[PDB]
């Protein structure tokens, strides 16, 4: 992997093959995706995709560990200060790109 | 020292003279551990 592509893939957190993340689009980020264009499949997900991505494969970064989101208290203890207290609030903050 | 002392009094004197949805908001109020303490007593 070339040095510039390798850095951009690390900023997106796609350090491994078939890794997935959500990216909110704008001039800054859309031009990053152009650099890594040969290395990524991307597009616009729908409400169902956000649902199933977060329910089946949703893991939280809690104290720098990969903890499955098996309880709402996991989301509330970390994102509660932003009023995000359940998986549904999490899906709404992602899907609608909240503040 | 004289200028700093003088301005502190001048500064202090001026200061001393100068001095989503109704349902979801209601529930978010009740679920608040502190504020909804009197409301949760009401429901029970």
């Amino acid at each position: 992997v070339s040095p510039k592509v390798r850095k951009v893939l690390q900023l997106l957190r796609l350090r491994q093959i078939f890794n997935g993340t959500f990216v909110k689009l704008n001039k800054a980020s859309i031009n990053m995706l152009r650099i890594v264009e040969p290395y990524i499949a991307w597009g616009y997900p729908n409400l169902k995709s956000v649902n199933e991505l977060i329910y089946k494969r949703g893991y939280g970064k809690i104290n720098k560990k990969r903890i499955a989101l098996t309880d709402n208290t996991l989301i509330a203890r970390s994102l509660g200060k932003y009023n995000i207290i359940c998986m549904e609030d999490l899906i709404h903050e992602i899907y609608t790109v909240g503040k | 020292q004289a200028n700093n002392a003088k301005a502190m009094a001048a500064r202090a004197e001026a200061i001393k003279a100068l001095v989503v949805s109704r349902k979801l908001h209601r529930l978010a109020y009740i679920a608040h551990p502190k504020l909804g303490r009197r409301a949760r007593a009401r429901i029970a």
């Binding site: 359940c86 | 529930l27 679920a31 551990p33 909804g36 029970a44």
Partner: peptide
Amino acid sequence: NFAELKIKRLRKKFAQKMLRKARRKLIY
């Protein structure tokens, strides 16, 4: 007297359950 102390414990356990109950309604 422990009877006085026990009620304090129970009213706290009831309080936490009501706070948990209202939190479930909010996310609902």
